[PDB]
Structure 1
Amino acid sequence: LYYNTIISWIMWYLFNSFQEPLPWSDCPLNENQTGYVDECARSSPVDYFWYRETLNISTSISDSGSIQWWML
C-alpha cells in the first residue's frame, strides 16, 4: 500500500526533469520581487521543493488538508 506511494513520489521527480534550470535548484521570490521566500532562505532550496512544493506538508498529524491533486 505505502510502497507504491514512494514510487509515485519517484515518478513526480522524473516528470520534473527535462529542464536545465532544475526546479529544486533555486528559491522563488516574494510577492514583492525583492528577496527569497522566508522559509527558503533559512532552509535549503532543496527543502523548499520536497516539503512545500511537493508534499505541502502541515505542522502535525492531527490536522489534514485536502487531496493535493498533483500527487493524485
Structure 2
Amino acid sequence: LFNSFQEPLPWSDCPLNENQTGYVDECARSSPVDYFWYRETLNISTSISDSGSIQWWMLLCLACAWSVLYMCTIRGIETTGKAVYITSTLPYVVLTIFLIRGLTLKGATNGIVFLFTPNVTELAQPDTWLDAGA
C-alpha cells in the first residue's frame, strides 16, 4: 500500500544493473512483478536452512500493522464497535467496483467457466474433501 502513490509503479518495470545497458538477469528471465515480490520486498533466500538478517524494511510495516491493531482494540468492545462501521462496510463497495471493472475485460467470461466446470474424477479423492472441510 505504501509503494503506491507514484505513477511509474515500482512493479511495472525492471531495474538496471551496474552497467546501465542491460536488465538484471533475475528480472530478465522472469516477470518484473515476480522480481519486485521475491527480491525487492522479501529478498527471499534459497532454502529454509538459510536464515539471514532481520531486513529492517519489514520491521516498520510489521510495527505499523500491530500499532494500528492495538489502537483499534484498546478496550475491546466500545472501541472496536466504533471502527466496525467503516471496516466491515468499505469492502462491499470496493469489491462491487472491482467486479464491475473485472467483468468487462478480455478474459472475463472466459476464465469464469474454468471455475464452474467440475471433473467427476476429482471428487473421489480424500484430499479435496479434507480441504473443503478445513
TM-score range, shorter chain: 0.7 to 0.9
Deviation per CA, 1:5-61, whole angstroms, max 9, x where unpaired? xxxxxxxxx000000000000000010111100010001000110000000000000
Determine whether 1:39 maps to 2:35: no
Point out the structure with max Rg over C-alpha. 2
Instruction: Report the count of equivalent residues.
Output: 59
What corresponds to 1:6 in structure 2?
Answer: none
In structure 1, distance between residues paired with 2:17 and 2:50: 27
Q: Percent identity?
A: 100
What corresponds to 1:48 in structure 2?
Answer: 35
Residue identity matched to 2:2: F
In structure 2, distance between residues paired with 1:16 and 1:63: 27
Higher relative contact order (CA 8 A, sep 6+): 1
Structure 2 gap ranges (5+): 60-134
Alignment RMSD (CA, Å): 0.4
What corresponds to 1:25 in structure 2?
Answer: 12
In structure 2, distance between residues paired with 1:63 and 1:48: 20
TM-score, length-scaled by structure 1:
0.80
Secondary structure of the 1:52 match is helix
TM-score, length-scaled by structure 2:
0.44
Structure 1 gap ranges (5+): 1-13
Regions of 4+ moved over 4 Å: none
In structure 2, distance between residues paired with 1:39 and 1:49: 10
What corresponds to 1:65 in structure 2?
Answer: 52
